[PDB]
Amino acid sequence: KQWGITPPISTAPATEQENALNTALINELKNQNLFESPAESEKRVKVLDELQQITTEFVKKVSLAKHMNEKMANEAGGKIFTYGSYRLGVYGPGSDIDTLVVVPKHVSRDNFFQDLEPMLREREEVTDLAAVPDAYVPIIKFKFLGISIDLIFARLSVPRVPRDLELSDNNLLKGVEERCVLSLNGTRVTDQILQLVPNRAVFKHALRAIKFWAQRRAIYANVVGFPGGVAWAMMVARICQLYPNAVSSVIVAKFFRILHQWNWPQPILLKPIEDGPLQVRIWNPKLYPSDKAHRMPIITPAYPSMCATHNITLSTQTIILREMVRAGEIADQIMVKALPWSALFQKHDFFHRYKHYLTITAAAKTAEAQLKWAGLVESKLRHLVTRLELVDAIALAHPFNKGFDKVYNCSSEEEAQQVASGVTLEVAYESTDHEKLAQIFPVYTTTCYIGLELEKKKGRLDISWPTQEFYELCKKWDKYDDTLMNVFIKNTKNTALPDEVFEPGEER
């Protein structure tokens, strides 16, 4: 069989040395503690079975509440799906479970918040329940027995959602709101990624390596213009198709070279782009100028096909390709036993590569608002880098979204507003992390960075208006409380970088 839309590059089996290196790669992954215990694996299956049970109870309640007869409420059904990194089977310890609840026609999005959310708060196993009703996609986040869940809603047009319902039928997209079809896409894409690889076990191991490399190099974030988890998976899936009989160590070594030499902006396709019954746009750079603008397009296989990497800016494209060339050189040294596998997962050098950094800090006086506020500021970083690209002096803006959390203990309430406004003065602070509590004057800050690459002379660095534009966008937030939340930007030279961004064994 031929996998993918292109004849393979090689169908040779794994050699003797590539099997030994494949074992040493899998061992390196275990040594980094990237696998959870089989206990917590069973625990996630237990939580999904509970949620599936709550789903049947939730749909039956809404059915009976709308005066449907008892027989049809039992037939009403409802099914829990999973997508993202859990459905792929490559997730770290403590990672979330992207979950989809699919309901029949008579179950409204109001029932998702006014009936299902009261059901989850009623249960003892659920903590940290936080529903955002004013989001573009309806989502409810909560911990079930300590396992973080992200639950999105999706109403169909079928009178009943049976338990054996597969989402492969494109006709099930008929008559559902264009909100709800994108929520179906998360599962339909993930199900198809597993169907299109020739070897699922080789794919999962290869993805776990590539994912860990991207996270260690801090190029694993679609919020700031890098490929997201779905994007990296479709990339690793493409190489599996091109080497259908290879082991994981081969897939990884060929992954970096094939992708930085790829003829961009030619898209990465796992299968031919489908047609469908809906009258909605499919990704076509020949028809839509916005699709034409995508620089490194990775196209999802589920109809309707879209570009998972539309956020990729000019800077972030340059950085993805730089990192692939770097990792390609390390991998080829690993495959000739010149280097161990641990070298491939050497952490980023973001705080050593530039002479000019931007410090972006979101501050709030209370820890509850700092969680919401620091997430708003992070979502506007991708616009700052694209705005900084429009500066003549700036050739590249490197976004670093691993926030650094501090808590400043000030004496006067005026000093609280003074440090929240950017005047650090000489106040004592302590480092913390995003695990919160739910004359003490607290100020909680989250610090991101943007590394600047200046243009070189052929034949003056003023970011005042991009900085001020950034403040207005953060403060246009519908939940911006001018009493608690603040945000400021500082020009930071490499020598003035704080000790927080360096580990004990690093230089400055």
Author numbering: 13 to 450, 475 to 495, 500 to 548
What does the report in the manuscript say about this coordinate set?
The S. pombe orthologue of the human PAXT connection, Mtl1-Red1 Core (MTREC), is an eleven-subunit complex that targets cryptic unstable transcripts (CUTs) to the nuclear RNA exosome for degradation. It encompasses the canonical poly(A) polymerase Pla1, responsible for polyadenylation of nascent RNA transcripts as part of the cleavage and polyadenylation factor (CPF/CPSF). We report crystal structures of Pla1 in its apo form and in complex with Red1. Taken together, our data reveal the molecular details of recruitment of Pla1 by Red1 which leads to hyperadenylation of CUTs, serving as a signal for exosome-mediated target degradation.
We expressed, purified and performed crystallisation trials with the full-length (Pla1FL) and a C-terminal truncation (Pla1Δ14) of Pla1. Both constructs readily crystallised under a variety of conditions within 2–4 days. A comparison of our crystal structures of Pla1FL and Pla1Δ14 shows that the individual domains have undergone significant movements. An alignment based on the middle domains illustrates that the N-terminal has a modest rotation of 2.95° with a 1.13 Å displacement, while the C-terminal RRM domain has a more pronounced rotation of 9.8° and 2.26 Å displacement.
